[PDB]
Design a protein around this nucleic acid. Sequence first.
RNA 1: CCGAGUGUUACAGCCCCCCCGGCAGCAGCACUCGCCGAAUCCCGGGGCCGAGGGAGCGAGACCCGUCGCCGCGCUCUCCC
RNA 2: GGCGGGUCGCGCCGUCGGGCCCGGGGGGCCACGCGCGCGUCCCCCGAAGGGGGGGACGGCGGAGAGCGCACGGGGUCGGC
RNA 3: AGAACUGGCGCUGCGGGAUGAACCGAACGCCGGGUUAAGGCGCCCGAUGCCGACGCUCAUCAGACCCCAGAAAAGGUGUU
RNA 4: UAGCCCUGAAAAUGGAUGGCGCUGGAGCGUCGGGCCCAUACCCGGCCGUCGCCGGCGUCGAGAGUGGACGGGAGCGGCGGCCCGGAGCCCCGCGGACGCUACGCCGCGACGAGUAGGAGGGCCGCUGCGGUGAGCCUUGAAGCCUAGGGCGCGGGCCCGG
RNA 5: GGUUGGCCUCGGAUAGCCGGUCCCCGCCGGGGGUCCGGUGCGGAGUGCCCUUCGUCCUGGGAAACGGGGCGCGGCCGGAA
Lengths: 236, 51
Amino acid sequence: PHCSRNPVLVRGIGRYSRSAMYSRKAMYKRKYSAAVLATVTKPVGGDKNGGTRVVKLRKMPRYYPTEDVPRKLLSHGKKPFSQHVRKLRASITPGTILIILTGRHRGKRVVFLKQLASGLLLVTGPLVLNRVPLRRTHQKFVIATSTKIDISNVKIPKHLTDAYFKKKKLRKPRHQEGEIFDTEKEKYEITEQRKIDQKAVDSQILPKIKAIPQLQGYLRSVFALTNGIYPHKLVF
Amino acid sequence: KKNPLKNLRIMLKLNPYAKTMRRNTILRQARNHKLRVDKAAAAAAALQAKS
RNA sequence: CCGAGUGUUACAGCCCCCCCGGCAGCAGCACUCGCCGAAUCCCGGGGCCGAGGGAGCGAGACCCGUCGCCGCGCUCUCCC
RNA sequence: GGCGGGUCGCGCCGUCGGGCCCGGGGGGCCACGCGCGCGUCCCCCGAAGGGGGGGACGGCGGAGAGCGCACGGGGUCGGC
RNA sequence: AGAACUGGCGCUGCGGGAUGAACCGAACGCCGGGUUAAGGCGCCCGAUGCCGACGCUCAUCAGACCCCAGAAAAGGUGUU
RNA sequence: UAGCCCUGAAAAUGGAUGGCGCUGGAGCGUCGGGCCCAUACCCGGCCGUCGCCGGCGUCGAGAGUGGACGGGAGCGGCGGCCCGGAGCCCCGCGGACGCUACGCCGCGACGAGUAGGAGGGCCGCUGCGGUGAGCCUUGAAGCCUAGGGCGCGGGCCCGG
RNA sequence: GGUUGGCCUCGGAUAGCCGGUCCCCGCCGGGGGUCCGGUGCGGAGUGCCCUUCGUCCUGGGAAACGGGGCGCGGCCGGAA
Ligand SMILES: [Mg+2]
């Protein structure tokens, strides 16, 4: 199984033509001329009785609803969210300082690390400077500041991923009693593994942060529009 | 009705020559670009060789 | 002595114009020649509003029409 | 002895046209049964009225199998 | 007051002409996005809050946008 | 001689470039680039109307825009001792909705309106023939309602 | 209903602004020589706070007023 052998230049237009790919593929000398299980039967299992049992499983249903809707019409490919594409802005490369616009944090300045596998971008302005742990954020709710920090060979742990930073819920109790789900008052003390996962990266970005002078106090600060400070007049 | 002149392969359902009309013109204005970028450099490189 | 400001007849001892012979290498270009254009044309991106509506010529289909046209690549040869 | 009209011939023009051709001394092509015989055209050879090649064929002598993809493809879904 | 040709009003909303039968644009099912027509963009009042271009003009009665809603002969060493 | 301004230029309630107001213009002439919006134009959704049709094949077995057999001769592809022949559904007995044909489905263009003319009313009122094994003193008609809705509307259904 | 306040020369415009030896008006102000800056940088295209997460440990620069006051008391300043 070779690779694509036809380098694109524009989306869906290969560089080599139809006849030029007939000779790159050598299709002239590979032209050709050459050319269930309903189920398994079961043992009988009983005295005075033979006749190994019927070839049938996954039987006809016990019930049909009184009405049914017609089948859809397929239309095209409209692939699901696990397969779409991952797009970044060119103003966001790793190491960049970001500004959180809509969180609980709302203007805390954070250090961008990695764009995760399903769109959200992994970020921490480190917990000793901000109050920002290894949270995900979303791309279009941050502001890429034109300052960066050069962390191009630090580390990133492979185990912390999109299914790491998820919220947890298992809806067993359906009975109307005065406790709200018995697990909703509780802030998670499962940090005991997430705390170790930060000190693996909290202890190797503060060397980078405490190399350029003012930056650690800049990260302690928060962002605010004050009086004549207008965005569109501001070089971020 | 989709729009030819806006998406590919609705042109090509109507005009198959419009693909090879298009990579014959994306190739040549990628090589005319190279012919002018190298000309602007290699002229002023010898100018930078003097001074 | 130097410099400035005026007024004369004066034609290189600032310059400018018109000619007869040139070069660099030519740019509708170092935003005034901006002209008029694209089978002589394409690429990429941002804003907005919208999402209306039993396709299987095959298998005698069976959890389950990722199907038609259209353009595309991979294998049923081999080597690096 | 001057001023035009039609025709012939000469050299000179133009990213001319005829896919032309015609023998010779890198880029593009929706163009691909070696063996031979059905015509056509061209190249050869000493002859001099024959064979040996090549190019192309709107016709016959030589001349099947889909396998899983991906999709600017018969009006949006998420297996967020 | 009375005819000719065409359009309109009557039967016809809508944008504009401040106002309106007939002017000027445009004719109309119920809505969203886009773009314009006539007209406009100091503020009523949407839009020139353009570093708009060249000139003309001083009124002790200035001027100010089809129909259209106020002026003439004559005159001024007023200014161009 | 002709542009602007001035004289010529007087009317009755207080008053009209629409007003406020404007004089490096918000005036007049010649023009530029932006920009503002109609029921107009374009693209989309829906309603109706007109036009042109589709479907009796509910045919999960129909497979059909040229098909037969069956004889005399031929090549390919199939199972060899270079000679050879129909298999009619099945391991699953299964397979959505539909066609009030006066109903369903598709596609395209259109939609102003007085006088006037037609069509539809599953709009409404009163009585009659039929019919709902209708409905009710465990509450009919009528009337009231900041109650719940439905229809483009005429109107209607329900709750109290 | 609002998401920080500016606690102030006169004004000229074919001209203004600042700093300053000497000559005069009860230790302030008016005049002139002198020096500046001036598409205003002693610049509301600005300036002071600030975009201050808090705290702890622990060193340098700065800093000798303390700064928030429900303290206490006194002064005179401000009549459009
Ligand atoms: Mg007209």
